[PDB]
Amino acid sequence: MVDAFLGTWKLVDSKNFDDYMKSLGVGFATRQVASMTKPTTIIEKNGDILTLKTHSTFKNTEISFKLGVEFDETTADDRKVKSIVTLDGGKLVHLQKWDGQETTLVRELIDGKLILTLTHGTAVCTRTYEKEA
Ligand SMILES: O=C(O)C(F)(F)C(F)(F)C(F)(F)C(F)(F)C(F)(F)C(F)(F)C(F)(F)C(F)(F)F
Numbered sequence: 001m002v003d004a005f006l007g008t009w010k011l012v013d014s015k016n017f018d019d020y021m022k023s024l025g026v027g028f029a030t031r032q033v034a035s036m037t038k039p040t041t042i043i044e045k046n047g048d049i050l051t052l053k054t055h056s057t058f059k060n061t062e063i064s065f066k067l068g069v070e071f072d073e074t075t076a077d078d079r080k081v082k083s084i085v086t087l088d089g090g091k092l093v094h095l096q097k098w099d100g101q102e103t104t105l106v107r108e109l110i111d112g113k114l115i116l117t118l119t120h121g122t123a124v125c126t127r128t129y130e131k132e133a
Pocket of ligand 1: 021030
């Protein structure tokens with residue numbers, strides 16, 4: 001059910017990312033670098049285990065998880081969160097919880113592009129990724 005998300009994806013559009021980062025308390029200097037970074041996201045599957053890599057000239061992350069099973073995560077901005085990823089309406093929904101706060105990272109395929117919607121507080125960011133061959 002996750003299979004159309006798998007592969008290597010490159011950032012090609014970003015809307016409201018500074019709002020999202022600011023809502024999370026990211027400092028201005030980090031926001032400035034991040035606003036000019038174009039990550040590569042790699043999503044791979046081995047049986048029930050997904051691995052999601054995010055690579056850039058600034059911050060690099062990797063998580064592995066089973067759909068529907070909570071996992072500990074340390075985010076790129078150093079938040080220590082409780083996470084769960086699940087398919088919902090064909091979208092890959094990643095929920096992070098910490099300190100009573102939540103943020104969602106929702107991935108949906110639209111016309112072959114991967115649209116990542118990031119919500120925290122009132123901030124809603126949309127990032128578009130295109131598949132690499
Ligand atoms: O995958 C993406 O496109 C993505 F990198 F934007 C992300 F992973 F979704 C993200 F969650 F938004 C995030 F990692 F960029 C963050 F949460 F904004 C962040 F950690 F705060 C950061 F911007 F990376 C910071 F530099 F502050 F550390």
